Amino acid sequence: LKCLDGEDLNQGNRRRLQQLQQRDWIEQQIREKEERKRQEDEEKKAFEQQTLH
Amino acid sequence: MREIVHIQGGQCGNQIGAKFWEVISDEHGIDPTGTYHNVYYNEATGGRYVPRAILMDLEPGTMDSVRAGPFGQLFRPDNFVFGQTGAGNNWAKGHYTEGAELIDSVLDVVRKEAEGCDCLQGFQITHSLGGGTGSGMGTLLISKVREEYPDRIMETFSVVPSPKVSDTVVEPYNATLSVHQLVENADECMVIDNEALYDICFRTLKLTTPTYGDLNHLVSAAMSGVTCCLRFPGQLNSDLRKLAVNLIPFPRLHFFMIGFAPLTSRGSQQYRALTVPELTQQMFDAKNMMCAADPRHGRYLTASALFRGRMSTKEVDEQMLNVQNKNSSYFVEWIPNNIKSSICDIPPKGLKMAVTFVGNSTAIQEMFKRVAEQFTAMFRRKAFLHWYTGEGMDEMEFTEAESNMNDLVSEYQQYQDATA
Ligand SMILES: Nc1nc2c(ncn2[C@@H]2O[C@H](COP(=O)(O)OP(=O)(O)O)[C@@H](O)[C@H]2O)c(=O)[nH]1
C-alpha cells in the first residue's frame, strides 16, 4: 500500500494525446464539411443554369 | 391504394380535364401512346396505362374536341358517355328531362370503375357552374353518388361566373341552382374564376395571346399540385382528407380558394431568385389567387400550403410563423395557428420549388353576395323562368335555393366578426 497505481502519474501524456486526437478528428470533420458545403453550392448553381436555359 | 375516379362534364369540365391529364401524363413521364418512359392510371395488357376517368356530356362535339387533341388517345372509348341529342345551356334540361334520363349509364360506368378498385378514397370532379349540361349533370351525379357511396369523399373543382362581365346571360340562375345542390351533398369544393386568370396571365406572366389552353393549364397545374403530396414521398405527406379535416370547421364552410406559385414572366424570372421567402411573398398576394375575391376584404378561417421539391422545413415554418404573426389582422383568432403546412418531396418538371395554396377564407362570401343580387333582380320579374318551368321545375325549389344561399353567406358574415 506504500504506492497505489490508482493515482494517475502520466496525466500529462493522457492530456496531450487526447488533445492531438481531438485536433486530428476536428481537422477531418472540417475538411468533410467544407467539401459538403461546396457540393451543395455547385448543385444550386446547376439548378440556376437549368432555370436560365 | 387510395385511388381517384376523375369525372368531368360540360365544356369547361372537358377542356380542363384534357389539359389536366396532359399535365399528369407529363409528370409521371408518359407519352401520348400511354406507355411509361395506381392513384390516377390503370394498367392494361402490354404495359399500357389508361386513365381512370369517365367523360360525360349531352353534345358529342366536345368529344371530338378533346379526343383529336394531343394526349387524347389515352381515355378508353368505353367511357365517353355522350348523349346524341343536345344540351341547350339550361339546368332543368340537363337535370330533370334530357340530361337526367341518361344518368343511369353514367352510374353504370362509375360503378364499374369503382367496384374494380381496392380502397377508393374520393371522387374528383371538374365542371362549370352555370353551363347547362355541366352544372346539371354534375349536381345530379353528386346527389346520386353521395347518396350511394358515403364512405368515400367528394371534391369538385368548379368554375364560378366571370364576376365583371358574364359569359352567359342565365348564369345566376344555374349558379344558384347548383349551389343549392352543393352545400347539401358535397365534402370539398374549390372555386375558380375565368377573370382573375386573365389578370394573372396578363400581369404575372406578361402574356399577350392567352389562349384558354394556357389558363386551363394553370388551373390543372394547381389541381395536380394539390394532391401531389399523396402519390409521392414526403417529409410530411397530406391527402384529400387531411385537408378536409384541417380546413372546414363546420359542415358547410367548405368553399375554398386556389393559388399556385411561382408564376413569373421572362425578365421578372431573370431578376428573382428561388428562395421560399419569395414564394411565400408571392403566395398570399391577392393578385395571385384563382378566385376573383380580394382576400384583403376578409380573413382566412384556414389555409393549407402544400410545398413540393426539397427544402429545409425550418424555413417553411419560419415563413409561416412570420406571415401569420405579421399579418395578424388578415387571420381570424379563435382558431389559433390557423395556417397548415405540408411538404412533399418532388418538384415540378423543370423547377426547384413549388407551392400550392388551398385557402378556406371568409372573403369569398362577397362573390356569393353578388350572385344573391343578380338572381334576386332576375326573379321578381320572373325573367327567363318559363324555360326552366317548361321541364316540370317547381319554382318553389328556386326559392329555397336562394334561401339556402342566404344562410351560406350569412354563415360567413357571422364569423369574420366573431371575437374571443
Ligand atoms: N378557363 C376556361 N373556362 C371555360 C372553358 N370552357 C368553358 N369555360 C366556361 O364555361 C362557361 C359556360 O358554361 P358551359 O359549361 O361551357 O356550357 P355547357 O357546357 O354547354 O353546359 C363559361 O362561363 C366559360 O367560362 C375552357 O376551356 N377554359
UniProtKB/TrEMBL annotation, chain A:
<protein>
    <submittedName>
        <fullName>Protofilament ribbon protein</fullName>
    </submittedName>
</protein>
<comment type="similarity">
    <text>Belongs to the RIB43A family.</text>
</comment>
<comment type="subunit">
    <text>Microtubule inner protein component of sperm flagellar doublet microtubules.</text>
</comment>
<feature type="coiled-coil region">
    <location>
        <begin position="23"/>
        <end position="51"/>
    </location>
</feature>
